[PDB]
Design a protein around this ligand. Structure first.
Ligand SMILES: *[C@@H]1O[C@H](CO)[C@@H](O)[C@H](O)[C@H]1NC(C)=O
Ligand SMILES: *[C@@H]1O[C@H](CO)[C@@H](O)[C@H](O)[C@H]1NC(C)=O
Lengths: 50, 36
């Protein structure tokens, strides 16, 4: 949840890109927009000379 | 939902209506009337 440069409409809470996946949220208590970047992941390859 | 727009007569312009009120639960409303 990092700060984002987006600017919601005053009534808007959700933030969504074209994936049906949430990518921004308006924080309820303090009115700010936070990003929803997923936690890092990826395959693990092993380089071996045999 | 509400919106207020100025004109010079439904104009040809485009303006989306911003939601403003989400009044809580009621029961079946099948009829209405305006308070003139
Ligand atoms: C609730 O009040 C205002 C309204 O958003 C906000 O600034 C404040 O941080 C919130 N929390 C408290 C404890 O006042
Ligand atoms: C209107 O809503 C009421 C809820 O109590 C229910 O009887 C029905 O869905 C509707 N009534 C009708 C169709 O007479």
């Amino acid at each position: 949840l990092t700060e984002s440069n987006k600017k919601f409409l005053p009534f808007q809470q959700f933030g969504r890109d074209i994936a049906d996946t949430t990518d921004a949220v308006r924080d309820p208590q303090t009115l700010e927009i936070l990003d929803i970047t997923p936690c890092s992941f990826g395959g693990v390859s092993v380089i071996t000379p045999g | 939902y509400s919106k207020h727009t100025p004109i010079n007569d439904l104009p040809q312009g485009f303006s989306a209506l911003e939601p403003l009120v989400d009044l809580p639960i009621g029961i079946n409303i099948t009829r209405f009337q305006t308070l003139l």
